[PDB]
Amino acid sequence: PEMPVLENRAAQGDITAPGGARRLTGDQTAALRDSLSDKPAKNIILLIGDGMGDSEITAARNYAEGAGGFFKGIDALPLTGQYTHYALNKKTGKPDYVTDSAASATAWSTGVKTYNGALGVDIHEKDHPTILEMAKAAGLATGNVSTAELQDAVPAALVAHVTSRKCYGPSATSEKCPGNALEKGGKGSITEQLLNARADVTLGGGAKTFAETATAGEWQGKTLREQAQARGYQLVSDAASLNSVTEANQQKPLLGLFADGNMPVRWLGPKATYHGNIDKPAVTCTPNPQRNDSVPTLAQMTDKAIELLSKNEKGFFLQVEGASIANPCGQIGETVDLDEAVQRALEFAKKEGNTLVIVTADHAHASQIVAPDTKAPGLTQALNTKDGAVMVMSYGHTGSQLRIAAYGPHAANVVGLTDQTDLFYTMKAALGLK
Amino acid sequence: MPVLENRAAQGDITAPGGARRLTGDQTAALRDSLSDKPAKNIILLIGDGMGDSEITAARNYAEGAGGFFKGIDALPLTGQYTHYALNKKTGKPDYVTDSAASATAWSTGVKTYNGALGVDIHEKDHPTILEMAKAAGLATGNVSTAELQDATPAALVAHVTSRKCYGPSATSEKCPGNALEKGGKGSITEQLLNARADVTLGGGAKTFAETATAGEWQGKTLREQAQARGYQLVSDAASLNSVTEANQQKPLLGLFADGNMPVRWLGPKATYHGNIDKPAVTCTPNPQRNDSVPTLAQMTDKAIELLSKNEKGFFLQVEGASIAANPCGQIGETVDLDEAVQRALEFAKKEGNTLVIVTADHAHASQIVAPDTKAPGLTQALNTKDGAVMVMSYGHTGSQLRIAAYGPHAANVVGLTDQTDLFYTMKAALGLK
């Protein structure tokens, strides 16, 4: 029946003994042969960890699971490679080696390289369709989930085509993206285009911008929240209301707004400081008390989106972003949040059997794991890990290629060296979109 | 089985689809890359400090952002491995390894403390993959552009409590338990001569001028000892080229520099705000490179030619050394390694029973940063093949990093593994006990 998920690649024994630190128990050729299918993907779930390069994965694993531990979500995908995410200089069209989130999200959502800060447009400011828009056009259900504000670059890139990622609402758009402003003849702000795109399920932060009023069109003078209500959206704002939702579709599309800005971070800790690993004690991260059972977690939004979207017989596309808001504990807790959502995605995909799950990052954070005695010129912090040993992290974004991993039909297309724009084409082809 | 022939960007990177590295679905290609048949031979290539960041920076500089390393980027099966060491007293993980503990991990399958070679945290010796290959009748090679006493080549042939124990004098001082005159197996260089790989090629002639303190060759230089023990000594490209065989009667020992072999490229050191305060750098060829000193790729090709005569098979390790905060030196070292990987893949594709593995011991701390960056450490702007500026910042590390493979049993590098799994992968692929 099922393509396998890696069940346990923790160190298998005593890490001080011969063979004790192995993560494999035997040859993987048969398992990998059994991981390969080019049958259609009925569904795709793409999980994005903001800033989640290989270093961030390693630091979080070290801290939360121990050096020899295992992320049951992030580390469990059997097919892995590395992809490149360079942007373009807008004026020259030459590579810009260090992307922002907007140019990278544009690359995987549209298959076109662009300039830093662009959403859903190329270097000539020309719109190109997104994977979510194409999935909808093919009759698939669509979901867009983030613990960031929903106007932020990663969720916005699926639904908005604007010349600057700053163009959150009518007022920023009229100022910074005048050609996109609704009353200046464009398609509108990020939030307005989101409302037009009408995904079946959209869940995240960013309530604040919905208080703005539209400047033109049918809903001029209404807030964007009022516009959503008038256009048939089901609006929820907490865990209980999200739980009360029984269906989400084009008649009653779901819009969950769970915070005015970003949703709460999982863990708190002090900021990193100059010579912090030397001058301050080792840190143990703590729970954020703003986290509570009235605010759904990334994993809970993921699971609810899967339930709702999986009702569509033709299939669904779902993107889930674990947002990042030099705070090591914040960053590590965000990786933990993403791992839980990946587990939900893989649990569903393993059972359903026709679901491609992809886990990657937009670009990497600058954090590095360094020797405990390090005297570094940037910001550092010592942390007390799950092993009862000190790990030091140093902040001294970046251009390094980074991990992409997948499970399910067409997952072979993430192995080896690829570009971030290949991810668009992988998703397009896997779902049979044109 | 297919090598990745071209994963450069396929067109105009400003146009839809023009930056794609794929031309179509890869399921069939990847399935065809998977074999569970025996490996006759293994070639393990190690780039010192070559994490994903260094691969990217060198690609961006030498090939352009959308370019492709025909060796490093062409291996079809890829994963990431963990390389943490251990605290010697507590046995808890130490999150940032040195080159010795990492080399010990893949060559013996045992984690150890930073600085250890071929011993565990209890200072107990464990056999290496090269020693096991030789015991099984396979030919063995050990190639490096570093000094041959350095951690990576040393780990295959020496068991010492500190990587500093290069020769008799340092060993007597720093590894007294290993010192020959104290009943130990000897210095790194003495254990190298005992191990008697069929092919050993690299730098580090300096330590061979020391004399042994005890044993059969007491008072002779270690070079004299090698000569006395039947080694073919060579010291330049012509002498290397004239070698027609290497085996246990006539093992080959090439010593091509006093210390490390010459770096490929020169450039200035990175400096505070160097990307702002100094012009963009174009790397230059090192005048000390010349056709009398074999390159990493040439040593790799000659080793393959000599070792491939063994009908049972061979094990070969090739290390591209990294000699502070010098972007051009570092990038040129990755280019050197890519050339050697090309030679290994060319051989492996023709021979068909060869597992080629490319990875690093641990990653350098360098990062690729925005052009306008004002960073607290050292920075440099570089003029790349794209005719654009790339900035590197220096401000070793613990990140997991790429491992890639081609040939029988290459599946065992995909996904998350540990650096110690690499030992077991090589053992099992060659059918060693």
Curated annotation (Swiss-Prot), chain B:
One of its GO terms (molecular function) is alkaline phosphatase activity. Its main location: periplasm. GO terms for biological process: protein dephosphorylation. Binds 1 Mg(2+) ion. Binds 2 Zn(2+) ions. InterPro entries: Alkaline_phosphatase, Alkaline_phosphatase_AS, Alkaline_phosphatase_core_sf. It is found in: Periplasm. Isozymes 1 and 3 are a dimer of identical chains, isozyme 2 is a dimer of heterogeneous chains, one of each of the subunits from isozymes 1 and 3. This is Alkaline phosphatase. It comes from Escherichia coli (strain K12).
